[PDB]
Amino acid sequence: EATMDRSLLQRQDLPYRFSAVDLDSVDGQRHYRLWLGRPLQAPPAAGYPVVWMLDGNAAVGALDESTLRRLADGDAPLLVAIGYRTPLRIDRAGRTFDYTPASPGQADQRDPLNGLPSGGADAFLDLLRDGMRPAVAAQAPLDTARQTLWGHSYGGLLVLHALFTRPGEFARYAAASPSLWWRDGAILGERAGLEQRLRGKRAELLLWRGSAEPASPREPGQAMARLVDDLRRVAGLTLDFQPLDGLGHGETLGASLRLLLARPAVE
Template sequence: MKIVPLLITLLFSPVVIGQTLAAPPAREQTVDSSRLQSDSQAYRFSTFRLDSDDGKRHYQLWVGHPNRPAPAAGYPVLWMLDGNAAMAVLQPGLLEKLANGQAPLLVAVGYQGEQRIDRNARSFDYTPTIAGQAEQLDPLTGLPSGGVDAFLDLLSQRMRPLVASVAPIDTNRQTLWGHSYGGLAVLHALFTRPGEFSQYAAASPSLWWHDGAIGREAHGLQQRLGQARPSLLLMRGTAEPASPRGQQQADAERPMRELATELGQVNGLHVSYQRFDDLSHGAMLPASLAHLLETLSK
């Protein structure tokens, strides 16, 4: 495991994420995908819609195709949760660099509608079930929760075949990125289905959720890995509090640091941890995704 301090201002051009960092997306803001209606020089985008199996959540997928031939094994794929908000990070300059690097297929998994953050849907889709609770409710919002396994099943059984029907994909090079509750979903995916993706990127995961329930899911990961050899990228801003209802603490980073240390001892799992100096929780959404995209562009 490596722990690497990260200075955002040294890594990213203001042209790429300057505006995004200054105004982190809020759920009331709307998504503007008008520039994606026409093909860019680097990527062309198409959209797909589908519903959850129970018909209660309605998804929109933005699929970005690199304007270059697919490798023999197919395109690597980057799956981005909170896809409506993620689309705002895909600035033209960054897409150009990405197309000249690994050129992955980009799949932003969002929700139908114009809101960047769909609080109701993500409270259900990105959270695990808590054993022994008759009613699964999110401790922060009071909304229904516990649907992450159904969501991940939907991704693997319906979304992935849909994407594969329009572009050849490399099933051995799949990355899952998520922020906050999305980061919680990424960790749950790693702990329960470590062979589903080759890389897991969890930005500011909600480790506080239900008194640290996600950390307990890591127990037994060594045995569940089997032949899988995934990597995990953990990311956190140094200005983030330990929980959304708490004040900044002297060592708010401790839960993340301890998780990184624990997971770094799992044979077969490569763990890296990036700190983002002076960034708040909201600012970490665009910064963490931009960092991952920068990595893939090299």
């Protein structure tokens, strides 16, 4: 419903400069703009570490000047906000499709919330690998062993799908207020076999949830607590759950992103 925040983009007085890289989905239906924030600092020998953010029209709006100045500590990351070509802060249709996994059973697969087409998670993650990273790498040197993937809500659902089904693409996975309720907890089933799929890899998972969030949009915290308890047991996986006192669902997006970017950079 609301406009995105372009102010940051056209600014010049910070230690980051932002440029756009455009791509379409393979099926031609969805239209992306990746906003690349490049440190003024020269790349490390092995390339910049990279932080990929879903809901990027929104994520750019949540990159504050204070955070951006501190990120320039001599090992600054490349920031890649994966947005949609639209004025809006949020792209309902695109994001609903791109960030939800397929539910094998269903023919026309439709979001149980807003009824839009869903189930494009794997196509999206494939496009990240096969089209986005190629384009981003051409603009700046990347350290592909030091990559972070962040998302909020359905974006967090996506992030969990990536870790659970295709672990090791990213070093750090960061899921804020992941929509665990989706399809009566369907994402929770995808976690079966994770330890086996993680063999020979090490990965970090950061989770957030706000104290004021309901269990779904229509027993708060139970699902998350059980997921955390389970994942704590997984060899190779470092888990950090951070509850956010005083926040509801919408507000955890910005909070998680600011807190993520304040963390130590990935090894």
